[PDB]
Structures are given as structure tokens and as C-alpha cells.
Structure 1
Amino acid sequence: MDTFITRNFQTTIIQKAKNTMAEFSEDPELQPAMLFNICVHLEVCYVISDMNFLDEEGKAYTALEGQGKEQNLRPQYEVIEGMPRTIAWMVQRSLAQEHGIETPKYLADLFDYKTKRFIEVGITKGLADDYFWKKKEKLGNSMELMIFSYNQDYSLSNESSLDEEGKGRVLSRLTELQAELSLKNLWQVLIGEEDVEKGIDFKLGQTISRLRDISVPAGFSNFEGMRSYIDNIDPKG
């Protein structure tokens, strides 16, 4: 369950995924599938972001091994997913408002300074174009959203922003991760949809239960009997 994600993903990435799920108000234990999806989404977002960097003349260049922190001070792609809802909304509205761009009605996943556009990075399994057009249905071109898939298919938007090196890096990493999970036989653990309807958890401990038991009117032993009497007795007459 969590062992594969802990061994493969970093501590910060999994912590961000857990915080996002907690903000989304879903139990972390009974649905590992959402946890894995969030982890892989934010991880591939980081992989994409760690490719391009900004110069002083407004061009997007590439870094490699053997570079200091003075040359690596500001990024190219600003990653929004994994941040809290309030922080993410603040970042998106700030970029849109100071770049003279109307803010979309849905939270984005990345922002690019070279084209100054918001991107909704997604990963699917089926037809890439089908998911691409399904995402295109809502707003059309408010975000140059990008669609990836595990079968090495992808529906890149018109605003081309990634070259061959980074795309191949991401695809090879995805293939390696899929192979590593498949040899461990985790695919059936995640594909199978197990969503029972969940409510609000409020359980009474021992002390409060004992207080409630001794708090019933005279003539009842415990609170269960009193509650049953309240529900199932006609007090008429």
C-alpha cells in the first residue's frame, strides 16, 4: 500500500499529496488510488518544471550537471498543484492579474512565462484525444492543458512548450515506474474502484459514554435503552 509510494516517492512529495487529500476531505487509508494519482501528477509536474530556466533577456534555456545556486534562482514553469487551495488561488490570481490575463474559473496546474499561459497537466489511460477534447469541453482554450497516458500516447496542446529531451525523460521515467509497480503486482490494487459512501466520523470514547449512561432519566440502565424507548414508544395518552 504505502510502502511502494514511500520507497519510490520523496518525503516532501508524499507529504504534499497527503496534505492535498486532507484538504479534499477524504480518508487517506481506504483510497490509495487517489494518493498514487496525486503523487504521480505532482511528481511529473516537478520533472517538467526542473527542465527550463529563465535568463535576463526573457529566453528559456536548459541547465545540466555542474551548476550553482546563483545560476538557478528563478524557474521557468511555476507549479501550482500540490499547494493548498488558498495559496494556489492566490498564486493563480496574482499571475493572472499582474500579467493582464482573465483568471479562469478552475484552478490550473502550471503557469508558463514564455507564453504566459495556464496549463492543466493530466494523465489518463484511454484515448489521449478523447480525454483532451473532454477537458476542452468546459472552457475550450482558457488553459493550454496537456494530456499524457501510460501507453506512451499524449495529446499536447497547440502551445508547444516542451522539447524532445524532457518529454522522453518523462516518458522513460513513467515506463520505468509502471514496470516497477507491475512486477510488484499493484495494478489490481488501484484500478478496482472501491468507493463506499462516507460521512462524518464522530465516535464517543469511554468516559463520555459512561457519563451519558449515568445521565439518563431514572428508569433506564444505559443510553441505548433510553434511545430505543424514545424512538419506539408511542407516548399517547
Structure 2
Amino acid sequence: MAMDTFITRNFQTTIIQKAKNTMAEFSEDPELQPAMLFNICVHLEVCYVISDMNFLDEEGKSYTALEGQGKEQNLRPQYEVIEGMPRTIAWMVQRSLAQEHGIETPKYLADLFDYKTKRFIEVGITKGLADDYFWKKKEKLGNSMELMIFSYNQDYSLSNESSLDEEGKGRVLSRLTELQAELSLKNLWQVLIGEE
């Protein structure tokens, strides 16, 4: 099975197209770098999954999607998802958010903004070990963003003060575990170069 085919059979078309658009923004070709396309797809999916799990009411109280059902009109998502927007627009969303909350605009483009903590978030996904990648991304980012790191081997690196709960962590990690297993069944795994 081609990685191209793996991608088609394992991700939503919406995810795939955004991933291709990102590679277009980066002038890279999906056909020539399927590992990169896969990586972008997984990253996108993680960001959306994280952002659909928490809501905040007007008073700042935190709800899960289930707990909040019937009240959603009166809730707003806890995280703004910046990843997956066209990049040119994303930069301006980031700036707008920073300005609205009286905080510094980060130098680099974030993946999420946490309305509760008023922090930008960078999400990382590794085939290696989460803490190693945390330290690497720290060199670039400093304290400019919260890092949320997940790995395909149930490893992760999250702030003690992250808004993501056990259930949400579990949901991200299970999907990654599931992808690793599916990749392996097609012998696409030990081929893979990940985000690290």
C-alpha cells in the first residue's frame, strides 16, 4: 500500500486537503514527501481534537462537550484553533488574539490559543520520546508558548497546569497508538520520519 493510499484510508478528506494546502504554502509536493503529508495530517487532527473537548461559559467555568450539551449557545470553546487556517490569516488571528488579551504576540505561529490561561500553545507529535522533543522546541520557543507533546508510544509531555484532562489526553494518545498500529500492519512504520 502506498502511503498516499494509507493517508486516504485513514484520514478525513477535509484533513487531507488542509495538509496539502500547508505543503503548498511551504512549496512542498505531497507526492514527493508523503511522510510530511502524513505528519501534517496527524498534527491537524490532534489540534482539532484538543479544541473540541473543553468549553468555557461567560463566567470562565470549564465544561466538557458532553457536560455542556444544551447550553452551547451560551458557551465558547476553551481553545481557539489556529492550525488549519490559511497561514496568512492565521498570523492575523494570532495578533488579534494577543492584542485583545494584552499579551505579547509570539514570534512564531502557534497552533492553539487557550482562552482560560491566555496562553498560546504549540502542539508536537513524535515517533520518539516526548520529553526529548519538548527540550528541542523549548530552545526556539522559550516561555513564549505552552508546549503540548504527544508520542505514538503513549509518551507525552504536558504542563502540570495544562487545560487538557485525562480523558482528552487519552483520546489523543489512543488515536496516535491506533495510527502506529495501522502503519505497522502495512509496514509503513519503520520507514517513517516524524516531526522530530
Q: 1:70 to 1:117 in 2, by over 3 A?
A: closer
2: CA distance, partners of 1:72 / 1:51: 16
Q: 1:87 to 1:186 in 2, by over 3 A?
A: same
Runs of 4+ residues over 6 Å off in structure 1: none
The alignment of Structure 1 onto Structure 2 pairs a total of residues equal to 194
- Encode CA deviations 1:209-235: one digit per residue, 9 max, x unaligned: xxxxxxxxxxxxxxxxxxxxxxxxxxx
CA RMSD of aligned residues (A): 2.5
Displacement of 1:121 after TM fit?
0.3
Q: 1:56 to 1:65 in 2, by over 3 A?
A: closer
Displacement of 1:34 after TM fit?
0.6
Which of structures 1 and 2 has the larger relative contact order (alpha carbons within 8 angstroms, sep 6+)?
Answer: 2
8 Å CA contact 1:76, 1:113 repeated in 2: yes
Q: 1:73 to 1:21 in 2, by over 3 A?
A: farther
Displacement of 1:49 after TM fit?
0.8
Displacement of 1:60 after TM fit?
1.6
Q: What TM-score, normalized by structure 1, do the two folds share?
A: 0.75
Displacement of 1:27 after TM fit?
1.4
Which of the numbers 130, 154, 157 marks the counterpart of 1:155?
A: 157
Which of the numbers 174, 184, 187 marks the counterpart of 1:185?
A: 187
Aligned counterparts, 1:163-174, within 5 A: 163-174=165-176
Instruction: After superposing the two structures, state which structure 1 stretch, 41-50 or 71-80, moved more.
Output: 71-80
Displacement of 1:54 after TM fit?
1.8
8 Å CA contact 1:32, 1:190 repeated in 2: no
SS at match of 1:41: helix
* Identical amino acids, percent of aligned pairs: 99
Displacement of 1:149 after TM fit?
1.1
8 Å CA contact 1:128, 1:155 repeated in 2: yes
2: CA distance, partners of 1:188 / 1:125: 10
1: CA distance, partners of 2:127 / 2:195: 15
Instruction: After superposing the two structures, state which structure 1 stretch, 104-113 or 165-174, moved more.
Output: 165-174
1: CA distance, partners of 2:97 / 2:45: 22
SS at match of 2:17: helix
Displacement of 1:159 after TM fit?
3.2
8 Å CA contact 1:52, 1:62 repeated in 2: yes
Tell me whether 1:113 sits opposite 2:115 in the alignment. yes
Instruction: After superposing the two structures, state which structure 1 stretch, 64-73 or 83-92, moved more.
Output: 64-73
Q: 1:109 to 1:193 in 2, by over 3 A?
A: closer
2: CA distance, partners of 1:114 / 1:176: 30
Long gaps (5+) in structure 1:
195-237
SS at match of 1:22: helix
Q: 1:72 to 1:172 in 2, by over 3 A?
A: farther
Long gaps (5+) in structure 2:
none
